[PDB]
Write a protein that binds this ligand. Structure first.
Ligand SMILES: CC(C)CCC[C@@H](C)[C@H]1CC[C@H]2[C@@H]3CC=C4C[C@@H](O)CC[C@]4(C)[C@H]3CC[C@]12C
Ligand SMILES: CC(C)CCC[C@@H](C)[C@H]1CC[C@H]2[C@@H]3CC=C4C[C@@H](O)CC[C@]4(C)[C@H]3CC[C@]12C
Ligand SMILES: CC(C)CCC[C@@H](C)[C@H]1CC[C@H]2[C@@H]3CC=C4C[C@@H](O)CC[C@]4(C)[C@H]3CC[C@]12C
Ligand SMILES: CCCCCCCC/C=C\CCCCCCCC(=O)OC[C@H](O)CO
Ligand SMILES: CCCCCCCC/C=C\CCCCCCCC(=O)OC[C@H](O)CO
Ligand SMILES: CCCCCCCC/C=C\CCCCCCCC(=O)OC[C@H](O)CO
Ligand SMILES: CCCCCCCC/C=C\CCCCCCCC(=O)OC[C@H](O)CO
Ligand SMILES: CCCCCCCC/C=C\CCCCCCCC(=O)OC[C@H](O)CO
Ligand SMILES: CCCCCCCC/C=C\CCCCCCCC(=O)OC[C@H](O)CO
Ligand SMILES: CCCCCCCC/C=C\CCCCCCCC(=O)OC[C@H](O)CO
Ligand SMILES: CCCCCCCC/C=C/CCCCCCCC(=O)O
Ligand SMILES: CCCCCCCC/C=C/CCCCCCCC(=O)O
Ligand SMILES: CCCCCCCC/C=C\CCCCCCCC(=O)O
Ligand SMILES: CCCCCCCC/C=C\CCCCCCCC(=O)O
Ligand SMILES: CCCCCCCC/C=C\CCCCCCCC(=O)O
Ligand SMILES: CCCCCCCC/C=C\CCCCCCCC(=O)O
Ligand SMILES: CCCCCCCC/C=C\CCCCCCCC(=O)O
Ligand SMILES: CCCCCCCC/C=C\CCCCCCCC(=O)O
Ligand SMILES: CCCCCCCC/C=C\CCCCCCCC(=O)O
Ligand SMILES: CCCCCCCC/C=C\CCCCCCCC(=O)O
Ligand SMILES: CCCCCCCC/C=C\CCCCCCCC(=O)O
Ligand SMILES: CCCCCCCC/C=C\CCCCCCCC(=O)O
Ligand SMILES: CCCCCCCC/C=C\CCCCCCCC(=O)O
Ligand SMILES: CCCCCCCC/C=C\CCCCCCCC(=O)O
Ligand SMILES: CCCCCCCC/C=C\CCCCCCCC(=O)O
Ligand SMILES: CCCCCCCC/C=C\CCCCCCCC(=O)O
Ligand SMILES: CCCCCCCC/C=C\CCCCCCCC(=O)O
Ligand SMILES: CCCCCCCC/C=C\CCCCCCCC(=O)O
Ligand SMILES: Cn1c(=O)c2[nH]cnc2n(C)c1=O
Ligand code: NA
Length: 386
């Protein structure tokens, strides 16, 4: 069958993906630019990721269309056409890893997050990661390429000129680079690091939530202990455990509530130390008023903040997982090409499918933000309506 027919389907699909990648990710950038509620360090990496995806549509997809034709080119110019998409994928990986680390810092040390993770430092990190992405993705242009061993028969058959090759991805980019350096070292290892970070994020959230509930139960259990105590020493034991737990939960209406709680524990402790059991128990009963009016409100707000962090971490993890799902088939095919020379090469239609799937990753993030983050979804609606 004429190659232009199957080429037409592949090219049409690539162009459709390019349009959608541009439109959706331009919308992401317009949303962060316009909405100050979206202007935080996490979303600066989101914007960097959306910029990489815009460039997939503007440059990498036109380059992929071009390299599918095998047109005659100087080999090093062919290399750039071949490898620029690896720059964008590498930049995406750095942004994804940054987002993961950012959410870990926010959940593990929220008291020093704002002083540690700043906008100026983030912009510097983004710049360094773009430079590193060019270095990693264009490493074949530094000499790790097949330009020294051109396919002269293929070039002659296509009428290429002297010093030119048929510009095809697997003819110029070495597969050992693609498998060992790009895939294993530069893609698989960072994705596994992201997995580790997300595992630590969710474990940290679950621990802080058993801790919030454990302190709440300890407060209520020790109150019952005081009510049914029969001597001052038992009242004293329970209050001492309550006092240490109250300060542990303390680490304007928030501070006042815990100021009342500790002060009321101290009142009952002094009565308990005087052997006045009934008076200490009555003073300890006043703690329930503070618990209902203040402490329970702090417990439901701390729980609410943690659940929103879990939700935001899951949204980011879905983005990272979709990157892996969209890119792994192409990398896995390269592994079969490289590691199994006795295996027939993956057919051309499957190569095209795996390439298109990798590009489709540049469409999906705007949808995840719209469905999972209300501030983005609402800002998307205002932009579209207006
Ligand atoms: C800032 C942006 C818009 C600039 C985009 C420039 C792109 C399209 C340019 C930069 C380098 C160029 C390549 C440089 C060298 C060669 C080798 C030549 O034998 C065929 C064309 C080819 C393969 C060029 C294709 C076009 C190219 C990829
Ligand atoms: C990462 C998740 C989505 C799994 C993706 C698995 C895909 C990429 C796997 C599953 C089965 C695989 C194929 C199984 C057998 C062959 C025949 C061989 O001569 C060339 C490679 C080829 C054609 C493989 C290419 C990659 C392949 C299609
Ligand atoms: C965490 C996971 C997803 C990492 C990705 C798994 C990759 C590295 C694994 C999955 C299946 C594997 C392939 C399965 C079958 C073969 C055929 C054999 O003749 C050579 C190795 C080769 C080609 C393997 C190479 C590595 C491979 C592609
Ligand atoms: C090559 C460029 C491609 C597009 C990249 C566009 C990136 C610019 C987006 C600016 C933006 O949205 O940043 C938010 C704002 O700057 C925070 O204060
Ligand atoms: C918008 C227009 C995009 C059209 C892109 C033009 C691509 C021309 C190459 C072509 O159609 O042929 C492919 C090659 O000849 C067979 O593998
Ligand atoms: C903003 C800027 C956007 C516009 C930039 C240019 C647009 C498309 C490039 C398409 C490449 C066209 C190359 C034609 C190749 C050609 O003439 O064919 C060679 C022939 O085979 C030898 O005889
Ligand atoms: C906004 C930015 C806009 C940028 C978009 C550029 C589009 C396509 C890349 C074209 C890649 C190069 C095309 C090569 C065709 C060519 O050179 O063919 C002539 C002959 O092959 C030489 O010997
Ligand atoms: C051929 C073209 C190839 C170009 C390669 C680099 C392109 C784009 C990177 C810039 C986008 C990064 C935007 C991140 C958001 C940001 O910078 O915000 C920082 C803010 O100032 C914190 O206060
Ligand atoms: C900083 C990196 C600068 C690297 C300079 C890039 C030059 C690469 C070049 O022209 O080398 C041709 C061939 O790849 C060599 O074997
Ligand atoms: C996770 C990456 C580890 C997976 C490593 C897969 C290597 C496949 C391999 O080494 O197969 C070569 C075989 O010897 C050909 O004859
Ligand atoms: C914002 C605009 C920034 C402009 C930076 C330009 C960077 C792109 C340059 C690419 C040069 C690579 C082409 C060299 C191939 C020559 C072929 C050969 O030597 O065999
Ligand atoms: C999620 C399901 C995906 C839906 C469509 C995917 C179709 C592509 C799947 C291919 C599996 C293996 C194809 C093997 C092709 C023949 C290999 C060969 O002869 O060399
Ligand atoms: C999700 C993945 C994107 C959805 C698009 C799937 C359909 C076509 C992708 C292109 C596959 C190439 C078609 C046949 C080419 C050929 O016969 O050589
Ligand atoms: C949808 C985008 C439409 C562009 C059609 C391009 C046809 C592909 C080709 O001519 O080879
Ligand atoms: C992918 C799909 C997103 C497309 C929705 C259209 C919004 C475009 C508006 C804009 O460019 O700012
Ligand atoms: C191809 C490149 C597409 C990238 C476009 C991204 C759009 C988002 C932000 C660009 C900055 C907006 C500058 C003018 C805004 C005017 C205003 O603020 O009122
Ligand atoms: C600003 C949007 C970016 C520009 C998109 C341009 C769309 C054209 C798509 C692909 C370019 C294909 C170049 C043709 C390959 C040469 C064919 C040959 O010489 O054999
Ligand atoms: C800016 C958008 C680019 C404008 C027009 C698209 C034209 C692309 C033509 C590709 C030429 C392919 C060929 O002649 O072989
Ligand atoms: C060819 C490049 C290979 C080596 C990569 C070097 C790493 C990137 C170098 C310079 C990045 C410049 C921006 C640095 C500003 C830092 C701001 C900050 O972190 O607060
Ligand atoms: C060796 C790499 C050559 C130059 C590529 C550098 C890419 C652009 C650098 C930073 C992007 C802007 C960061 C935003 C703050
Ligand atoms: C930064 C990393 C790589 C940039 C290298 C630019 C390639 C130079 C063109 C090769 C050549 O002229 O022969
Ligand atoms: C594959 C290429 C290897 C890259 C070489 C490694 C060198 C670059 C690495 C990190 C750059 C660190 C940023 C330091 C710049 C100043 C920061 C500051 O002022 O605080
Ligand atoms: C992270 C995953 C990478 C780990 C190990 C790479 C495996 C070693 C390469 C295979 C042996 C070489 C061979 O094929 O003969
Ligand atoms: C490889 C996977 C990395 C995982 C590290 C451990 C995660 C955890 O302890 O919660
Ligand atoms: C390989 C990765 C496979 C699937 C990723 C799909 C979504 C995964 C994110 C988990 C959400 C918590
Ligand atoms: C193959 C590595 C998978 C990368 C996925 C990154 C995030 C997965 C979420 C885990 C909880
Ligand atoms: C085929 C052309 C583009 C396909 C992209 C579809 C995946 C993205 C978003 C899912 C829509 C909800
Ligand atoms: C290829 C990925 C396909 C679908 C995931 C993107 C759609 C997300 C909407 C929720
Ligand atoms: C990233 N990448 C690949 O890994 C690959 N393998 C075979 N063709 C390929 N193409 C066109 C590609 O862009
Ligand atoms: Na990407």
């Amino acid at each position: 069958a004429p190659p232009i027919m199957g080429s037409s389907v592949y090219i049409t699909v690539e162009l459709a993906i390019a349009v959608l990648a541009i439109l959706g990710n331009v919308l992401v950038c317009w949303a962060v630019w316009l909405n100050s509620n979206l202007q935080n360090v996490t979303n600066y990496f989101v914007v960097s990721l959306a910029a990489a995806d815009i460039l997939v549509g503007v440059l990498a997809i036109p380059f992929a269309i071009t390299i599918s034709t095998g047109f005659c080119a100087a080999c090093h110019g062919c290399l750039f056409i071949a490898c620029f998409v690896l720059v964008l994928a590498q930049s995406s990986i750095f942004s994804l890893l940054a987002i993961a680390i950012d959410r870990y810092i926010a959940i593990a040390i929220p008291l020093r997050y704002n002083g540690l993770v700043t906008g100026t430092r983030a912009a510097g990190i983004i710049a360094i990661c773009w430079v590193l992405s060019f270095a990693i993705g264009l490493t074949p242009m530094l000499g790790w390429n097949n330009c020294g061993q051109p396919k002269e028969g293929k070039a002659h058959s296509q009428g290429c000129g002297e010093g030119q090759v048929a510009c095809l991805f697997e003819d110029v980019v070495p597969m050992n680079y693609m498998v060992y350096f790009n895939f294993f070292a530069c893609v698989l290892v960072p994705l596994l690091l992201m997995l580790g970070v997300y595992l630590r994020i969710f474990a940290a959230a679950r621990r802080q939530l058993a801790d919030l509930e454990d302190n709440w139960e300890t407060l209520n259990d020790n109150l019952k202990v005081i009510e049914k105590a029969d001597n001052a020493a038992q009242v004293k034991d329970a209050l001492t455990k309550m006092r240490a737990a109250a300060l542990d939960a303390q680490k304007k209406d928030f501070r006042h509530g815990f100021d009342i709680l500790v002060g009321q524990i101290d009142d009952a402790l002094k009565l308990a130390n005087e052997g006045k059991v009934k008076e200490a128990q009555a003073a300890a009963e006043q703690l329930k008023t503070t618990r209902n009016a203040y402490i329970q409100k702090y417990l439901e707000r701390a729980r609410s903040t943690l659940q929103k962090e879990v939700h935001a971490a899951k949204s980011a993890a879905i983005i990272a997982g979709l990157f892996a799902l969209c890119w792994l088939p192409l990398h896995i095919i390269n592994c079969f090409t490289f590691f199994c020379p006795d295996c027939s090469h993956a057919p051309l239609w499957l190569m095209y499918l795996a390439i298109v799937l990798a590009h489709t990753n540049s469409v999906v993030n705007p949808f995840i933000y719209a469905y999972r983050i209300r501030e983005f979804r609402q800002t998307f609606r205002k932009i579209i309506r207006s």
